[PDB]
Write a protein that binds this DNA or RNA. Structure first.
Ligand SMILES: [Mg+2]
Ligand SMILES: [Mg+2]
Ligand SMILES: [Mg+2]
Ligand SMILES: [Mg+2]
Ligand SMILES: [Mg+2]
Ligand SMILES: [Mg+2]
Ligand SMILES: [Mg+2]
Ligand SMILES: [Mg+2]
Ligand SMILES: [Mg+2]
Ligand SMILES: [Mg+2]
Ligand SMILES: [Mg+2]
Ligand SMILES: [Mg+2]
Ligand SMILES: [Mg+2]
Ligand SMILES: [Mg+2]
Ligand SMILES: [Mg+2]
Ligand SMILES: [Mg+2]
Ligand SMILES: [Mg+2]
Ligand SMILES: [Mg+2]
Ligand SMILES: [Mg+2]
Ligand SMILES: [Mg+2]
Ligand SMILES: [Mg+2]
Ligand SMILES: [Mg+2]
Ligand SMILES: [Mg+2]
Ligand SMILES: [Mg+2]
Ligand SMILES: [Mg+2]
Ligand SMILES: [Mg+2]
Ligand SMILES: [Mg+2]
Ligand SMILES: [Mg+2]
Ligand SMILES: [Mg+2]
Ligand SMILES: [Mg+2]
Ligand SMILES: [Mg+2]
Ligand SMILES: [Mg+2]
Ligand SMILES: [Mg+2]
Ligand SMILES: [Mg+2]
Ligand SMILES: [Mg+2]
Ligand SMILES: [Mg+2]
Ligand SMILES: [Mg+2]
Ligand SMILES: [Mg+2]
Ligand SMILES: [Mg+2]
Ligand SMILES: [Mg+2]
Ligand SMILES: [Zn+2]
Lengths: 150, 50, 104, 81
RNA sequence: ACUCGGGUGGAGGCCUGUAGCGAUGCUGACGUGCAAAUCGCUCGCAUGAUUUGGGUAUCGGAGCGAAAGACUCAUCGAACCACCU
RNA sequence: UGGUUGGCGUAGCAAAGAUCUAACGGAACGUUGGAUACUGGAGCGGGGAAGGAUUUCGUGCCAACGGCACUCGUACACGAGUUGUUCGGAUACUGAGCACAACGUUACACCGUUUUUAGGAAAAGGGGCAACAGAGAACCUGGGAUUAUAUUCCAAAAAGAAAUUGCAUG
RNA sequence: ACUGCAGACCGUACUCAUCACCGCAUCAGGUCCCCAAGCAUACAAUGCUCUGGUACAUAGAGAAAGGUACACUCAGGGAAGUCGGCAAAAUAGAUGCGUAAGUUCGCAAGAAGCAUUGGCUCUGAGGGCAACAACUCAGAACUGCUUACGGCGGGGAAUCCAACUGUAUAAU
RNA sequence: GGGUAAACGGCAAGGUAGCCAAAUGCCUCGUCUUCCAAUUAGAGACGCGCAUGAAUGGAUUAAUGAGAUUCCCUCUGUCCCGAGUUACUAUCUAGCGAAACGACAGUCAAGGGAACGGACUUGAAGGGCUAAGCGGGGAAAGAAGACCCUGUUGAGUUUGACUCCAGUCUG
RNA sequence: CGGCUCUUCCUAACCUAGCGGCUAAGGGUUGGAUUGUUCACCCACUGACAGGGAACGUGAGCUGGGUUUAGACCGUCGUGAGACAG
RNA sequence: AACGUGUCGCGAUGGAUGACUUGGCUUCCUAUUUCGUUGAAGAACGCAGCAAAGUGCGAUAAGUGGUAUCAAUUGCAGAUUACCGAAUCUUUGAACGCAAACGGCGCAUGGGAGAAAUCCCCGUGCAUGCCAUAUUUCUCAGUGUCG
RNA sequence: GUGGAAAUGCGGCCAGGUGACCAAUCAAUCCUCCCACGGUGAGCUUUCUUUUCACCAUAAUCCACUUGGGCCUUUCGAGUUGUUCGGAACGGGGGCUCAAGAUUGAAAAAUGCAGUUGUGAGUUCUAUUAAAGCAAAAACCUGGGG
RNA sequence: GGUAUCGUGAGGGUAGUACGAGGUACUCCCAUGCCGUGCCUCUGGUUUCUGGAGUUUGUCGAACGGCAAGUGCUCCGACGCUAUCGCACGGUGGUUAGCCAGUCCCAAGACCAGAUGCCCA
RNA sequence: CACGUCCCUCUCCAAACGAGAGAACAUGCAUGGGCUGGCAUGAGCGCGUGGGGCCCCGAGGCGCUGAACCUUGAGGCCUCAUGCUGGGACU
């Protein structure tokens, strides 16, 4: 009845009882292992072993994580969530606007664009008159060539 | 839990060492009446609510 | 890794904030997160602003800190913003100069 | 749910042991004893309950000194010099 | 004259709904029960007059009540204990 | 009031899915291995408060109890076990509050105010209490350290490393 | 700076729960706090899984009637049942359309109502830092359906009452 | 003597605006219309309103509602009209093991009778013991009927009952 | 109270049968709208939709709509608490 | 047959009964009979070689001392009984230095250990009210009365 | 006492501050999680699998030293995801300072473990209603004055 | 006396009913309804043959194969059970429509000296 | 003790349990086969959206393939083939 050692093995294997393995074939030598120091002798001595944690593979998932990248498993039937839960409008607006405010800020820093037009666009960027970076990227180009002519 | 005034710990300590079977040799005295301890307590039954 | 409290207290109050901490022994261990105080401020009636030369020492360690860690070496140094001192140095001077004129 | 399910709602103590009587009758919130009336100097004692007067009167305890002074009055307080 | 787009923002005794707090219906189970009021599903509220621990205050011809004579230790159209009895 | 009875070996012991196997043990359910499921992180997880107060742990035991059984038990018996300058609490905060004092009232203090018609300093407004979730609060890890405690134990290479309080010392 | 000595008190085990507390019990009830993984998913819903835990809820054999169920299915009909659509079914996610009366102009509204939705192989879009990073949306062919988890509103038209959220006879 | 009804209330004044067989209408299922094959229902009108009506608030109201109510679509085992399957029970076993109840019992028909017998009269049945059901009877059990009445019994509430007592105010 | 469910018995017979009103208790006597109902009245079928008893058959069979205690609303009554077989 | 019924004989369950009674109840009496700030009663915690309770006691702890008495106590072991003067009498409690679900904390006094003093233990005092007194006649306060 | 033009750096009483008080969000770290790489161990292995799983740890304390804010100075734009801001000083250059944080190292590899970093996500911590405005105090700090 | 077998049948139960069409105004036909007694070939329903397939999420490293989702879900699905939702069947004699007997159902506590088989230490 | 009945055991037209029907060395049971059915074309290897540098990746598709599997079990068929084979109670 080596229920004590199993208490002990689990503690000094630094795991649960579920993982510790008391050798079925040598219950008696395990049986007289009253001290943690006795059991530690049994652990090096191989009567007691910690089993590896039961596997929980991600290979099904990583293979899925490939297919999702390629757009698999994406469509209408595969969507529980509202389009806003599934990807927040505030999340897009921040990203969109942090990006615009940064590019306006990059040109103002290299002065590709006037410190004047920066307000002209910093404030239009906030009214999403610019869908993208390259929408603003070309507006800065065409808001500027209009100046180049004069 | 942990908390106990020592006065309560002294009392549970009191009732704890008081919670003992009668000595065997006491029953062998002349004119003895006692057999079992009539004041055995069990935590799961009588409560020493302190 | 799930953690539990180590100090005898066990409530998620503001004064009992804790920090999860992987240890050298590869334990993951909650540690008391210090009850940081904001530091010295100019007085509440003067807009209550954090002072510049002063550290936000907890008074538990403020006793052991150097004196100038909690002040600047200016008049009212641990008490007033520099503008607040200058407000007075002007207001002391200019107000007395009008009174000195009201004798005439 | 006034029965067994509200018995679980009750969690505190009204009374802890008294410093005098040792009864679990010390109302912790009104720091007094329901039994001895402690901290009041004069101990609680009612004639409508003599079963309780009798229960805690003198002779109920050791009468630790009173045995000594009783023996002395009986012996005229005889004394060695 | 201050309106029509579009975004932004995150308001509300706002909505759906967890937890939690309830408790409508089945007049379901149980009904000498698991239970001296419970179980199941259903359902209601769930940012608020919310829920909740500790502490503290207010009670018996009294207390407390968004008021049902409700609740005040399974006791309330007057608790419980003892006593008169 | 005690005992006994029929009903009656009956009504039932049907909520939460679950055990199987071999080996061993034993006088005959446990233990281990394997298998199989379950919980499914708002857990039949790991720590605490209240509450409980020895239930802890080991050995033994299984008479009684664990509504079946037990070889097992939170049961029984015996022996153990809880280690702190730093954790929490007090020392040492105040809070809703409370109440000693005094004073007043009451046939009566077991009432009330909570400062007292009041000389409250002993070397302007008396004393105290009231929070283990508020304020305060000097310590960390490693351990081969237990049957059972550890931020508490470890020993001179303190495994070690700190911070901190008091006094004193150059 | 240093060093030297000293650093006292009490708590400390265990529990915290379908057997350790309250409920006469190892009672399906009640009981504050903290930590809290992976996958699907909008998710602390739900399902399932590593870790940590369990395998304790008396068991066996077999499968009358009648029951209980957090079990279904039912031809044709479709509320005729009934006091009463009670109970059950039904709706259902997301996207795009579309949305009436009435209105205090907020709403009503998820009104209502159609519609598309898988798999797969592609495409497009959306950024960062200098001189590599997401993962949503969009589209396209091809192809598949037994319409095939879980979870998830039934709707409408009216009358009475109360304006609203709320409270409230613990145990009809 | 005066004032006061968003005092109690009425409709001294005689019910105004409204609204209704309304949760308020006896008559009554009112009458008409609408809904159906058919409607004591509903909705909408009507108003001889037993007994509507204005902060004892009147009317009307979008939104809200586990509120009452009617109908509709969908839907279905609600039903026609039940059938089949599941799992746990029940059933049988091993273990364990109550309770309620319990005068005594316990087949009926007639009769009589405290006026509906298990005991009596006269007939008719009935071998005994069982197991599972069952729910007709045992006026089965449950609790000295919560109904009602009685008592020179209670308590709660009310009050312009009797008797008072504080409070208030006045002197 | 009612229904539902199930059985049963009667006949001053509704249908059916035999007669010429009589005999005849045999077997049968519908499905629905309103309403708790019974009852009534309607719609439809039907050969017909007869009337009754069985503790106004039948609640340890159910259902709980009626009656329906406490909650509440209205009308009327009441100075009021409260009453109303409304 | 069986079950069931019944008689009898034994036996179990049960605990009446009878006898017993170091208990109660009631009556009567006696006296050098009436607690406590010199810490009472009550409560707590402890003390025996094995001792939980009860009793006894209080860190001098089922007792120390005095007295009488005697040879025991007695479950085992091991080498008393009765009374009463001297003491002992822990934490508390009117409880009183301040508190108190704290075996907490003071101030002053003396001691102790100790130690590189700080810490630590201990004893005693330290509540309020009131009366007396300041016996070598304490220190004071009052726009009280005067001087 | 003292440096610095300045922001500021270093070496009884009185008044002020800390105590001290907000949902969220944003950001940083924390943490957890994922991925990539690399090692190490284990497992699958009929077939297939440069594969699946696990692990790759870094304590307080101390020492040197990017983001957000305040400020100094000097010579219509600024700004946030967002309801702002600016001669009562915006922006730009340099500086100061606070708050987090990073890295350098001491601890500390004599430990752990067993026979590596980095990268992504989440978590974490540090306005609104308001006729609601969202404790106190000791301790402690700093000053003014002495 | 056992055991067994075939029967007897006192007694008790007891049921068929209605409608319509044809044919000619009885007979005679032919369907149906209800009732009743069965049965399951067919047809429908039912699936825990979880049979076979498909399929969703989780999971087993993957394919295969599974597995979990309290039978995951969808399709088909035998056996069986069952439906007026299928199908078969529902008979006479005698007395005064009744009624009785029979057929039909239980039938020896109706105690069958009915028969019969076997053994009767 | 006879005959025999019963139990145990096996089968099911029976069945809550008793009872019933049967068996009693028997194609009885067991697997297997054949069949009748069911489903619906297995595993495995060997035309195609495009894609990657002649092949590879590719859902789906094709071929072997009315295949695969299942088919008596609360109890389909076939003797077709092999396999395995009394004790107790009572009078
Ligand atoms: Mg306690
Ligand atoms: Mg109560
Ligand atoms: Mg409570
Ligand atoms: Mg809301
Ligand atoms: Mg809702
Ligand atoms: Mg009332
Ligand atoms: Mg039973
Ligand atoms: Mg699971
Ligand atoms: Mg144990
Ligand atoms: Mg014990
Ligand atoms: Mg206060
Ligand atoms: Mg305090
Ligand atoms: Mg605190
Ligand atoms: Mg501390
Ligand atoms: Mg432990
Ligand atoms: Mg512990
Ligand atoms: Mg817990
Ligand atoms: Mg208990
Ligand atoms: Mg989840
Ligand atoms: Mg959940
Ligand atoms: Mg159907
Ligand atoms: Mg209907
Ligand atoms: Mg109807
Ligand atoms: Mg009907
Ligand atoms: Mg419903
Ligand atoms: Mg509109
Ligand atoms: Mg309302
Ligand atoms: Mg209620
Ligand atoms: Mg009308
Ligand atoms: Mg009115
Ligand atoms: Mg509401
Ligand atoms: Mg009576
Ligand atoms: Mg009279
Ligand atoms: Mg009287
Ligand atoms: Mg009746
Ligand atoms: Mg009845
Ligand atoms: Mg003792
Ligand atoms: Mg004291
Ligand atoms: Mg570190
Ligand atoms: Mg067979
Ligand atoms: Zn007391």
């Amino acid at each position: 009845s080596l229920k004590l050692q199993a208490r002990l093995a689990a503690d000094i294997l630094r795991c649960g009882r579920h993982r510790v393995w008391l050798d079925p074939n040598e219950a008696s030598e395990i049986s007289n292992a009253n001290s943690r120091k006795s059991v530690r002798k049994l652990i090096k001595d191989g009567l007691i072993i910690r089993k590896p944690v039961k596997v929980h593979s991600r290979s099904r998932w990583r293979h899925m994580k490939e297919a999702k990248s390629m757009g698999r498993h994406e469509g209408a039937g595969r969507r529980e969530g509202t389009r806003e839960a599934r990807m927040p409008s505030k999340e897009l607006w921040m990203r969109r606007l942090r990006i615009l405010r940064r590019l306006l800020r990059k040109y103002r820093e290299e002065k590709k664009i006037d410190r004047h037009i920066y307000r002209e666009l910093y404030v239009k960027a906030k009214g999403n008159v610019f869908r993208n970076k390259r929408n603003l990227m070309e507006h800065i180009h065409k808001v500027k060539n209009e100046k180049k002519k004069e | 839990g942990r908390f106990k005034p020592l006065a309560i710990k002294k009392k549970y300590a009191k009732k704890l060492k008081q919670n003992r079977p009668v000595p065997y040799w006491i029953r062998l005295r002349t004119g003895n009446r006692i057999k079992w301890n009539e004041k055995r307590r069990h935590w799961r039954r009588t409560k020493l609510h302190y | 890794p799930r953690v539990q409290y180590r100090r005898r207290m066990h409530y998620a109050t503001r004064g009992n904030r804790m920090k999860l901490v992987r240890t050298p022994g590869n334990r993951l261990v909650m540690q008391k997160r210090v009850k940081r105080s904001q530091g010295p401020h100019t007085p509440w009636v003067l807009g209550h602003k954090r002072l510049a030369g002063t550290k936000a020492l907890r008074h538990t360690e403020a006793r052991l800190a150097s004196r100038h860690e909690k002040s600047t070496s200016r008049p009212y140094g641990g008490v007033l913003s520099h503008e607040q001192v200058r407000d007075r140095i002007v207001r002391a001077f200019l107000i007395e100069e009008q009174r000195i004129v009201k004798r005439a | 749910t006034k029965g067994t399910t509200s018995m679980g709602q009750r969690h505190g103590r009204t009374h802890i042991l008294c410093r005098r009587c040792g009864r679990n009758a010390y109302h912790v919130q009104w720091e007094r004893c329901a039994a001895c009336a402690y901290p009041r100097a004069s101990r609680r004692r009612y004639n409508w309950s003599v079963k309780a007067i009798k229960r805690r009167r003198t002779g109920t305890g050791r009468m630790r000194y009173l045995k000594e002074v009783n023996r002395r009055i009986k012996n005229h307080f005889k004394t060695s010099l």
